[PDB]
Design a binder for this molecule. Structure first.
Ligand SMILES: CC(=O)N[C@@H]1[C@@H](O)[C@H](O)[C@@H](CO)O[C@H]1O
Ligand SMILES: CC(=O)N[C@@H]1[C@@H](O)[C@H](O)[C@@H](CO)O[C@H]1O
Ligand SMILES: CC(=O)N[C@@H]1[C@@H](O)[C@H](O)[C@@H](CO)O[C@H]1O
Ligand SMILES: *[C@@H]1O[C@H](CO)[C@@H](O)[C@H](O)[C@H]1NC(C)=O
Ligand SMILES: *[C@@H]1O[C@H](CO)[C@@H](O)[C@H](O)[C@H]1NC(C)=O
Ligand SMILES: *[C@@H]1O[C@H](CO)[C@@H](O)[C@H](O)[C@H]1NC(C)=O
Ligand SMILES: *[C@@H]1O[C@H](CO)[C@@H](O)[C@H](O)[C@H]1NC(C)=O
Ligand SMILES: *[C@@H]1O[C@H](CO)[C@@H](O)[C@H](O)[C@H]1NC(C)=O
Lengths: 48, 214, 32, 329, 49, 48, 49
């Protein structure tokens, strides 16, 4: 029976923009999208 | 005059290095197990068409063959490219040429009209792949030992590009020429490439091991 | 332990665009 | 910015914080000493010939020239106000002095000024569809200027194709002077009904007003693939460095990370390798030809651990997967 | 994946163009990558369940 | 009614016949040998 | 549904429009259909679980 998948997490901002400050500024217009995604993945990690 | 095109005639599709990884690509490649023409050199000068790319091959140790003619009409009225395996250095040039019926290297004669530019640079098998890509005529070459008498060796071998020529001239036909011991003016394998999708298996040392046709 | 292997994975086998693998809270020794 | 505890507080959007561990920030150390590399190119190609020569062909038989193995200066081009028309579609003009292109195709032709509009991606008309067709994904710049002083007395020698059986594909030419069968009636050299010559001359007389007057046109196309370069901007290169996070530029491509000598036996025809993610892992130096690896500096992931703020203000910091030898930076 | 952008390497866009158009191209890349992350995360939630 | 008419209008005799809500081809006049002039400016006659 | 495009018949856009403006319209329609499939395959996964 499987028990727990490998815990994974992703830096939404750096992954999407690769340290580009211009891209980060544009990403700010989308709001809390990165925060929500990080929250969900962290919840999964704790669940493992 | 026919034989099976075994799994060979593979080349590096790009200058990007890859190692110990599988990669997919779409490019012109003669497929495996296809047909290849063999000629009656055992004892008339031939001419053959160039569809998209021409897969040449021949067993040579003494370099009997001395390059290839390339062109659209070969009528001394349009640019056509010539390669000469001169003993001092290999020579490449594209010009209008007074092509004789038997233009073989008698030993040397040649011709030249409205030239654009010039460039200079059986125990073992030698083979070449010619791709008339838009604005770039890519050249590939190999030189490896063999043990087969006439048939193509079934052992796989893939290899790097010799040189790329920017003219990208119209190539609709191509001819073959070699050198004869005497000068008497009087009036090997071939394949055709096709666009296919290929899977390449790179290993350590960046060396291509084998491939699978889609 | 010898049957399951990660030799065919990507980042799990192996910096990699922000992807990260965190270790579990319990190592294999305490689980044993 | 005061301290990690404050950072955690403003991350959770609350003053009080309970006991626990909170993924809260990423410490990407990434220092950036500036280094650049290009080949020893000094020969300035004949840009002035394509832009200043007196003899230029017509659009139906537009000239083509290949530019390579040369230094490129674009300031001279965009600063020269004589170019009444100056547009780009794939690159900004200012950035041209900083990139490398691997090859450059210089096209030139003369047309009526009113027809200058047709020289652009997606254009239509006899000039675009029957004389000089650009690809829809064209990557370059279009340059043109009034040529009444040279191509006008009229200069009927400039011809333009009016029609063809089908529209031309990108970068195609059709100099076939065969009379078009413009109708059901067939013809063999007969210039009669529904059988007209494929080309006509321009009435380039200086009496005509601007726009109608002849305008010289120059078009540049860039082969953006970057394996070979030999064509780079005027900016000078500098000495490279090792084992330091530096912003690096080799042959026009760029990145940021650590540099180290590459043990991978690259073949002489290769320039740079790619990893599983298709990102550049190693590169061939354009001056010394040796191969040097490329790797990012660090994950930088940071989390904060602390008991309840109600209980205490002390905090500790965890550097995710970072080796303790490198965290002081 | 380019997602209709001229290139998938963000640095090329930042270097080849000036910001008045690079924001648009970047917006396309932003949309594509964000959609990829959303799909990935949702699939991870289902597998986690 | 115009190309095979028995009487034609003078330059001074202004005439503008109404043609609408019909479907007919220009190919007949396009291949009419008598029509020595079939010069067009707005569109190719093949677009009829 | 046109998803803000000029029409929903794919051949209609390619007929009435030349390739340049067709790209932006067909891109919008492609985005809309992709969104629908994503919604269709996400609900199916949940209903399968
Ligand atoms: C040696 C030779 O063939 N020269 C030709 C010349 O005859 C011709 O008039 C001109 C026009 O293409 O091109 C060159
Ligand atoms: C368009 C162009 O190249 N024009 C140049 C001009 O700028 C220069 O002042 C002159 C002197 O050589 O030669 C020509
Ligand atoms: C945890 C870890 O990776 N430790 C390494 C250590 O093995 C190495 O000797 C040292 C040299 O700088 O760098 C650090
Ligand atoms: C190859 O050539 C032979 C004639 O020598 C012919 O019968 C055959 O159909 C050709 N093609 C293949 C795939 O064998
Ligand atoms: C090349 O020439 C042939 C005629 O020999 C012609 O059919 C073909 O369309 C030409 N292609 C190019 C490159 O224009
Ligand atoms: C790469 O690998 C072999 C052994 O793994 C090594 O001896 C040689 O240097 C390389 N071989 C080739 C064909 O590149
Ligand atoms: C450039 O010149 C330097 C000496 O000034 C030399 O060391 C280097 O190898 C040269 N590189 C190329 C690519 O010519
Ligand atoms: C912390 O909370 C306890 C109750 O759980 C309370 O008695 C104590 O005074 C609080 N201390 C503060 C305000 O930091």
């Amino acid at each position: 029976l499987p028990v727990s998948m490998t815990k994974t997490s992703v830096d939404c901002t750096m992954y999407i923009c690769g340290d580009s400050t211009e891209c980060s500024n544009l990403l700010l217009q989308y709001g809390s999208f990165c925060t929500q995604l990080n929250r969900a993945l962290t919840g999964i990690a704790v669940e493992q | 005059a026919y034989t099976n095109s075994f799994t060979r005639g593979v080349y590096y599709p790009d200058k990007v290095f890859r190692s110990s990884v599988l990669h997919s690509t779409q490019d012109l490649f003669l497929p495996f197990f296809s047909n290849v023409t063999w000629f009656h050199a055992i004892h008339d000068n031939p001419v053959l068409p160039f569809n998209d790319g021409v897969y040449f091959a021949s067993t040579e140790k003494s370099n009997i063959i001395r390059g290839w003619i390339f062109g659209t009409t070969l009528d001394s009225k349009t640019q056509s490219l010539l390669i000469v395996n001169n003993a001092t250095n290999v020579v490449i040039k594209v010009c209008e040429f007074q092509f004789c019926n038997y233009p073989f290297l008698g030993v040397v004669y040649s011709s030249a009209n409205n030239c654009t530019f010039e460039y200079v640079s059986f125990k073992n098998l030698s083979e070449f792949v010619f791709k008339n890509i838009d604005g770039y005529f890519k050249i590939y070459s190999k030189h490896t030992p063999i043990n087969l008498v006439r048939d193509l060796p079934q052992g796989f071998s893939a290899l790097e590009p010799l040189v790329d020529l920017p003219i990208g001239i119209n190539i609709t036909r191509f001819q073959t020429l070699l050198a004869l011991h005497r000068s008497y003016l009087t009036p090997y394998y071939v394949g055709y490439l096709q666009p296919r999708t290929f899977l390449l298996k790179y290993n350590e040392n960046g060396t291509i091991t084998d491939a699978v046709d889609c | 332990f010898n049957k399951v292997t990660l030799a065919d994975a990507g980042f799990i086998k192996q910096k990699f665009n922000g992807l990260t693998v965190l270790p579990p809270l319990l190592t294999d020794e305490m689980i044993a | 910015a005061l301290d990690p505890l404050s950072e955690t507080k403003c991350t959770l959007k609350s003053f009080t914080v309970e006991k626990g561990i909170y993924q809260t920030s990423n410490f990407r150390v990434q220092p950036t000493e500036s280094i650049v590399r290009f080949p020893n190119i000094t020969n300035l190609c004949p840009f002035g010939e394509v832009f200043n020569a007196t003899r230029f062909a017509s659009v139906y038989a537009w000239n083509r020239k290949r530019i390579s193995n040369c230094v490129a200066d674009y300031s001279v081009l965009y600063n020269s106000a004589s170019f009444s028309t100056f547009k780009c579609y794939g690159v900004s003009p200012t950035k041209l002095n900083d990139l490398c292109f691997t090859n450059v195709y210089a096209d030139s032709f003369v047309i009526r000024g009113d027809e200058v509009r047709q020289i652009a991606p997606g254009q239509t008309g006899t000039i675009a569809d029957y004389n000089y067709k650009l690809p829809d994904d064209f990557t370059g710049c279009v340059i043109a200027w009034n040529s009444n002083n040279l191509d006008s007395k009229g200069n009927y020698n400039y011809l333009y194709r009016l029609f063809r059986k089908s529209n031309l594909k990108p970068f195609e030419r059709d100099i076939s002077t065969e009379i078009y069968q413009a109708g059901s009636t067939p013809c063999n050299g007969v210039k009669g009904f529904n059988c007209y010559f494929p080309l006509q001359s321009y009435g380039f007389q200086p009496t005509y007003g601007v726009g109608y007057q002849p305008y010289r046109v120059v078009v540049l196309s860039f082969e953006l693939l970057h394996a070979p370069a030999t064509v780079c901007g005027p900016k000078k290169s500098t000495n490279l460095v090792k084992n330091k996070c530096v912003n690096f530029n080799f042959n026009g491509l760029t990145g940021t990370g650590v540099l180290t000598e590459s043990n991978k036996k690259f073949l002489p025809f290769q320039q740079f390798g790619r990893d599983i993610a298709d990102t550049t892992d190693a590169v061939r130096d354009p001056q010394t030809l040796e191969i040097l690896d490329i790797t990012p500096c660090s994950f930088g992931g940071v989390s904060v651990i602390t008991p309840g703020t109600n209980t205490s203000n002390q905090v500790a910091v965890l550097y995710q997967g970072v080796n303790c030898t490198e965290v002081p930076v | 994946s380019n997602f209709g952008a001229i290139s998938s390497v963000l640095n090329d866009i930042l270097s080849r163009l000036d910001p008045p158009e690079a924001e648009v191209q970047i917006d396309r890349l932003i949309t594509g990558r964000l959609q990829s992350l959303q799909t990935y995360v949702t699939q991870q939630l289902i597998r986690a369940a």
